[PDB]
Amino acid sequence: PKIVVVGAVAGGATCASQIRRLDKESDIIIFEKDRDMSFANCALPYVIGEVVEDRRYALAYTPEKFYDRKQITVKTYHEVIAINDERQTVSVLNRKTNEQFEESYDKLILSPGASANSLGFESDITFTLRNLEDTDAIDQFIKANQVDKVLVVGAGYVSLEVLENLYERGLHPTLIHRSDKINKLMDADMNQPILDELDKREIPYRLNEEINAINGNEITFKSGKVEHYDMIIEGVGTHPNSKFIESSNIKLDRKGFIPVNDKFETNVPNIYAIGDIATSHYRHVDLPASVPLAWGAHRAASIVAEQIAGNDTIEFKGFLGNNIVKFFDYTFASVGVKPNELKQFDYKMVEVTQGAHANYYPGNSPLHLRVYYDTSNRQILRAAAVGKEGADKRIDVLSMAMMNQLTVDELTEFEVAYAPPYSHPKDLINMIGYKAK
Amino acid sequence: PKIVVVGAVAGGATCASQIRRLDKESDIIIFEKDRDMSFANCALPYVIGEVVEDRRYALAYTPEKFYDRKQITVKTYHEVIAINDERQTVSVLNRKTNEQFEESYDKLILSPGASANSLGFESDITFTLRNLEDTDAIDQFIKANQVDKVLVVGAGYVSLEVLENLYERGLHPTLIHRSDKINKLMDADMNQPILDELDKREIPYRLNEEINAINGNEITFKSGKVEHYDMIIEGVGTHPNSKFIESSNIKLDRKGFIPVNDKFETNVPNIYAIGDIATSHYRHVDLPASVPLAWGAHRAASIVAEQIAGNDTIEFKGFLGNNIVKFFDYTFASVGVKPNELKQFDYKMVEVTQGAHANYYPGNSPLHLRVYYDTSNRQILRAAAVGKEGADKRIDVLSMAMMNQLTVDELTEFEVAYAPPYSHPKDLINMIGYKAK
Numbered sequence: 123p124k125i126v127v128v129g130a131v132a133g134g135a136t137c138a139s140q141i142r143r144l145d146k147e148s149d150i151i152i153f154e155k156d157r158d159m160s161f162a163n164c165a166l167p168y169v170i171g172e173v174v175e176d177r178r179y180a181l182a183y184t185p186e187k188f189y190d191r192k193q194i195t196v197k198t199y200h201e202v203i204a205i206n207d208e209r210q211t212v213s214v215l216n217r218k219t220n221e222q223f224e225e226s227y228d229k230l231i232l233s234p235g236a237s238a239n240s241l242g243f244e245s246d247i248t249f250t251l252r253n254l255e256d257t258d259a260i261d262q263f264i265k266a267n268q269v270d271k272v273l274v275v276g277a278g279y280v281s282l283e284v285l286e287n288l289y290e291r292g293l294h295p296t297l298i299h300r301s302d303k304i305n306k307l308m309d310a311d312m313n314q315p316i317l318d319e320l321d322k323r324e325i326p327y328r329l330n331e332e333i334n335a336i337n338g339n340e341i342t343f344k345s346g347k348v349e350h351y352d353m354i355i356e357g358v359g360t361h362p363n364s365k366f367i368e369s370s371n372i373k374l375d376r377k378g379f380i381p382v383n384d385k386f387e388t389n390v391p392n393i394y395a396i397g398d399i400a401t402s403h404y405r406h407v408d409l410p411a412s413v414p415l416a417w418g419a420h421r422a423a424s425i426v427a428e429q430i431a432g433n434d435t436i437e438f439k440g441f442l443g444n445n446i447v448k449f450f451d452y453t454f455a456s457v458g459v460k461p462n463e464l465k466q467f468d469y470k471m472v473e474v475t476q477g478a479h480a481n482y483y484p485g486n487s488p489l490h491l492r493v494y495y496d497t498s499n500r501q502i503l504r505a506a507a508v509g510k511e512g513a514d515k516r517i518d519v520l521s522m523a524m525m526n527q528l529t530v531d532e533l534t535e536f537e538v539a540y541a542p543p544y545s546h547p548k549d550l551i552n553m554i555g556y557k558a559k
Numbered sequence: 560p561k562i563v564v565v566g567a568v569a570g571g572a573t574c575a576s577q578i579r580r581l582d583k584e585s586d587i588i589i590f591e592k593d594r595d596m597s598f599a600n601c602a603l604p605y606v607i608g609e610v611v612e613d614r615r616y617a618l619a620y621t622p623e624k625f626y627d628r629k630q631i632t633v634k635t636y637h638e639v640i641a642i643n644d645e646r647q648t649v650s651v652l653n654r655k656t657n658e659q660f661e662e663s664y665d666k667l668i669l670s671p672g673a674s675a676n677s678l679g680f681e682s683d684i685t686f687t688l689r690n691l692e693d694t695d696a697i698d699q700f701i702k703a704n705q706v707d708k709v710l711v712v713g714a715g716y717v718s719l720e721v722l723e724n725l726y727e728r729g730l731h732p733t734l735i736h737r738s739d740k741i742n743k744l745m746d747a748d749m750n751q752p753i754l755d756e757l758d759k760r761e762i763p764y765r766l767n768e769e770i771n772a773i774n775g776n777e778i779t780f781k782s783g784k785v786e787h788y789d790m791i792i793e794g795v796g797t798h799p800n801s802k803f804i805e806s807s808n809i810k811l812d813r814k815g816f817i818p819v820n821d822k823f824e825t826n827v828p829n830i831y832a833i834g835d836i837a838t839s840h841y842r843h844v845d846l847p848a849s850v851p852l853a854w855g856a857h858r859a860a861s862i863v864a865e866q867i868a869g870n871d872t873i874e875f876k877g878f879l880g881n882n883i884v885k886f887f888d889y890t891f892a893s894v895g896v897k898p899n900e901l902k903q904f905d906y907k908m909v910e911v912t913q914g915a916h917a918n919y920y921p922g923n924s925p926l927h928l929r930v931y932y933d934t935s936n937r938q939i940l941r942a943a944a945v946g947k948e949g950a951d952k953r954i955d956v957l958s959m960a961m962m963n964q965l966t967v968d969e970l971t972e973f974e975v976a977y978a979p980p981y982s983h984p985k986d987l988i989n990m991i992g993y994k995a996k
């Protein structure tokens with residue numbers, strides 16, 4: 123079949139690559155509205171912090187390399203502006219010529235993702251971070267203006283990683299957030315170490331704070347405070363790139379996302395949707411789920427590839443919502459339903475705080491593990507872990523447990539790999555099980 | 560019930576404590592043949608290494624504290640010398656006075672564990688390591704004799720830990736082993752980094768080598784080599800402490816262990832056996848298993864506590880044999896059937912070698928993960944992982960998978976916690992699933 127793909131990054135380029143792996147004869151074309159395909163979204167803050175300095179890490183492919191290795195045609199600076207589903211074409215705008223045209227397809231795959239929100243100030247010193255063009259612009263503004271002092275707005279993983287990286291680059295960031303609900307994928311009371319790490323390094327922050335006015339480098343805040351900053355990075359949420367889809371017969375939800383089935387089909391024949399734009403359901407509970415992260419994009423890419431050119435018995439089973447972020451010395455990880463989704467269940471909570479490993483083994487740090495479960499069937503609903511060591515391991519194990527519909531009580535049976543540098547004879551995970559009794 | 564426990568460490572002290580949690584009325588007495596209860600067997604190599612300098616870390620309780628806090632009576636230097644199972648008493652030797660006596664019981668719990676084998680040489684410079692008394696003796700011997708050259712015999716995980724610690728203490732160890740099967744819970748080819756770390760540090764080793772004769776500090780070897788050593792630490796395997804049991808009606812296997820059911824009952828009513836002395840079966844395949852490690856001792860202790868004083872529908876479901884050791888910069892972990900046990904199955908092997916985390920993120924290292932599956936049902940039989948980073952995490956996740964008899968193909972669905980310091984959007988575990996076709 124002729125295959126058209128919208129977006130050439132996490133979902134799009136992966137899906138197209140996976141299809142080629144299976145089908146060597148279908149013609150495949152990808153339209154990407156911006157300059158680069160296959161950029162490393164998740165590497166971006168580390169590029170800014172000069173942790174990553176080889177561009178070969180920031181960008182996996184050029185369209186030329188992509189064609190030469192995989193025979194996939196990628197048109198950058200081409201923005202799809204409409205989907206004409208009844209005639210099986212998309213309308214595409216060549217941004218270089220400002221000429222538009224129709225491209226036909228047998229199968230269409232939508233992976234446009236999402237864009238960064240902006241606060242909307244008229245400001246030459248304010249930037250968002252979503253792609254490599256953004257990253258290049260920030261790096262350039264920093265150098266050309268000898269930036270020292272940077273204001274970071276927002277407190278999600280993107281803003282937190284940018285802050286840490288700006289600090290390590292040798293700059294002087296300040297963090298503000300409109301409320302005190304930082305890092306909201308994590309249980310609110312488990313985020314204290316973020317503030318501790320800031321304090322330890324004498325990095326200023328103000329919560330319940332906003333930009334009120336901007337005049338050159340003079341920044342006036344809601345609190346009444348006035349300071350001067352050389353630069354601002356806004357990380358104040360995202361929104362779905364689905365405007366171009368609204369005129370079509372494709373069903374969108376009221377927030378602009380695309381509900382899909384377990385084959386990542388939309389309501390329209392021959393049209394699939396994957397990545398941040400797509401919504402689905404949880405694997406372990408009968409609720410809708412939207413998990414705009416890397417894992418879901420890659421997994422859907424593979425499933426769509428099988429559907430089109432491989433084994434169409436292969437279907438999605440739902441999300442668990444596993445997620446993680448590093449902030450300075452600490453790791454923050456969670457899986458399962460979001461904090462706000464718990465109220466839909468009659469649940470209880472159990473928790474343990476314990477050294478990640480043997481106390482007498484040097485380098486210990488306490489690890490807080492919390493697990494929520496359903497009282498009506500003992501099923502695990504959510505888990506969260508925070509500590510300098512061992513949090514990722516604990517959450518991945520609980521992710522596998524939930525995949526298998528394990529009960530909280532069954533966690534006593536988890537046979538951990540134990541030696542002093544790694545865990546305990548009754549691991550934190552085991553202790554969750556004993557304490558639920 | 561009146562409860563008598565034999566052995567006061569991993570199984571015995573733990574089981575007694577777990578019983579008290581549930582039962583505040585019953586009289587509980589533990590007999591321990593040596594000086595110390597509740598020593599940290601696992602910490603002992605690190606004591607020798609002076610990594611653990613403070614004894615509070617090597618000893619968790621005294622009989623006196625155990626009584627004040629738990630109202631359990633612990634009699635040290637008291638060796639149980641016979642089980643009078645028909646009258647329900649045990650014979651006990653007070654080693655201080657050399658007088659014996661009978662102690663009655665309603666329930667008897669046997670956790671006597673295992674003793675170190677010895678090569679049988681007459682030598683004042685040779686030591687084994689099994690308890691805190693052994694540790695104090697080794698430490699004292701090194702100080703008293705200004706030991707520099709040390710011969711470490713055996714390449715089990717304990718001996719490797721001892722070697723590493725002697726090295727970090729400033730001593731100069733040499734490793735020998737009677738065969739080339741070092742660290743034998745791990746795939747043989749995956750043990751190479753042990754030998755790499757030794758080579759890197761100019762720590763001598765000789766495999767397929769044995770002691771021929773000892774003449775003072777002069778050691779004659781099977782190879783014909785003769786060298787001078789100030790000290791010898793032999794780690795040449797263990798034997799079960801079951802001599803005191805043979806006269807009773809308790810069924811022993813031919814190696815001296817006690818087969819038990821999933822309630823950890825012996826063939827004799829009211830007698831339980833746990834810890835290194837007991838044998839059981841695997842959880843994921845129908846084979847007999849013996850897994851003489853900490854997790855099993857602690858798990859059995861809880862189950863026996865529930866049987867006696869709690870919910871007696873709680874039963875063991877078998878072992879997976881999860882195990883791990885650290886040796887210098889590398890981690891070595893495996894789970895499932897032993898290498899020698901694979902031949903009872905029609906099996907295939909899948910493997911990946913990939914960065915533990917994102918390539919661009921610093922301090923990355925190659926992680927080798929290998930998975931064996933049964934061709935008749937796609938079920939995972941065994942997994943192994945070796946590397947400086949991430950091996951413990953992958954093996955724990957796979958232990959949780961096997962607990963659920965998950966197939967190799969379903970690893971494709973494992974929802975990992977992804978950010979650049981931790982893994983990949985398609986983790987090594989997912990990759991095993993994709994490569995299984």
Ligand SMILES: *[C@H](CCNC(=O)CCNC(=O)[C@H](O)C(C)(C)COP(=O)(O)OP(=O)(O)OC[C@H]1O[C@@H](n2cnc3c(N)ncnc32)[C@H](O)[C@@H]1OP(=O)(O)O)CS(C)(=O)=O
Nearest residue numbers: 131132135136139140160161162163164165182416993994
């Ligand atoms: C933060 C956000 C995540 N963002 C991204 O991932 C965006 C950038 N990514 C992309 O554009 C694509 O995902 C690329 C093109 C980089 C990767 O495509 P694929 O995942 O299809 O893998 P690839 O074709 O590059 O193959 C390399 C490696 O994978 C093996 N392989 C892939 N699939 C399979 C299957 N299904 N079965 C067996 N093996 C498979 C393949 O063999 C391969 O080894 P080799 O290529 O042989 O040497 C995260 S971020 C971006 O890191 O910042």
Ligand SMILES: *[C@H](CCNC(=O)CCNC(=O)[C@H](O)C(C)(C)COP(=O)(O)OP(=O)(O)OC[C@H]1O[C@@H](n2cnc3c(N)ncnc32)[C@H](O)[C@@H]1OP(=O)(O)O)CS(C)(=O)=O
Nearest residue numbers: 556557568569572573576577597598599600601602619853
């Ligand atoms: C290597 C080799 C393994 N060796 C050993 O284990 C050495 C010998 N061990 C022992 O003697 C026992 O395990 C001791 C006595 C050390 C521990 O007794 P147990 O009951 O585990 O533990 P304890 O009573 O001390 O409780 C402490 C902690 O856990 C909670 N807890 C225990 N059981 C339960 C249950 N069933 N349910 C809920 N909670 C339980 C307990 O309340 C207490 O918590 P807090 O800290 O106040 O929360 C290894 S090594 C390390 O070198 O020895």
Ligand SMILES: Cc1cc2nc3c(=O)[nH]c(=O)nc-3n(C[C@H](O)[C@H](O)[C@H](O)COP(=O)(O)OP(=O)(O)OC[C@H]3O[C@@H](n4cnc5c(N)ncnc54)[C@H](O)[C@@H]3O)c2cc1C
Nearest residue numbers: 129131132133155163164202234235397398414415416978
């Ligand atoms: C800074 C940053 C850090 C992140 N870190 C993590 C992390 O640590 N862990 C994690 O799991 N996730 C992380 N993510 C999220 C992860 O990158 C996304 O979940 C993933 O990229 C989603 O893939 P996607 O294809 O749906 O969207 P994208 O990868 O963003 O790709 C969408 C592409 O479609 C293009 N497009 C949109 N509309 C059109 C159109 N009309 N025509 C043509 N092209 C169009 C866009 O230009 C864009 O290039 C991070 C994201 C960012 C921005």
Ligand SMILES: Cc1cc2nc3c(=O)[nH]c(=O)nc-3n(C[C@H](O)[C@H](O)[C@H](O)COP(=O)(O)OP(=O)(O)OC[C@H]3O[C@@H](n4cnc5c(N)ncnc54)[C@H](O)[C@@H]3O)c2cc1C
Nearest residue numbers: 541566568569570591592600639671672834835851852853
């Ligand atoms: C140096 C070392 C390091 C280790 N490291 C690890 C590790 O990293 N990870 C891991 O999982 N496992 C490790 N282990 C193994 C772990 O310690 C054992 O699996 C665990 O202790 C088994 O507990 P047990 O109660 O059966 O025996 P033990 O803990 O050894 O206790 C048995 C006790 O019973 C006493 N006893 C025996 N006979 C009698 C009798 N007749 N009368 C009275 N008392 C008696 C003994 O003196 C002994 O104190 C290590 C062991 C050692 C020795």
Ligand SMILES: [Cl-]
Nearest residue numbers: 185189195196
């Ligand atoms: Cl091209």
Ligand SMILES: [Cl-]
Nearest residue numbers: 222223224225
């Ligand atoms: Cl054209």
Ligand SMILES: [Cl-]
Nearest residue numbers: 211224225226
């Ligand atoms: Cl056309």
Ligand SMILES: [Cl-]
Nearest residue numbers: 300301302303
């Ligand atoms: Cl808010």
Ligand SMILES: [Cl-]
Nearest residue numbers: 405406407408
């Ligand atoms: Cl369900």
Ligand SMILES: [Cl-]
Nearest residue numbers: 622632633634
């Ligand atoms: Cl006494």
Ligand SMILES: [Cl-]
Nearest residue numbers: 636654655656
């Ligand atoms: Cl005396």
Ligand SMILES: [Cl-]
Nearest residue numbers: 511947948949
């Ligand atoms: Cl680490």
Ligand SMILES: [Mg+2]
Nearest residue numbers: 172174175176
């Ligand atoms: Mg640079």
Ligand SMILES: [Mg+2]
Nearest residue numbers: 204205206369
């Ligand atoms: Mg139209």
Ligand SMILES: [Mg+2]
Nearest residue numbers: 606609611612
């Ligand atoms: Mg000391």
Ligand SMILES: [Mg+2]
Nearest residue numbers: 963964965966
């Ligand atoms: Mg199944």
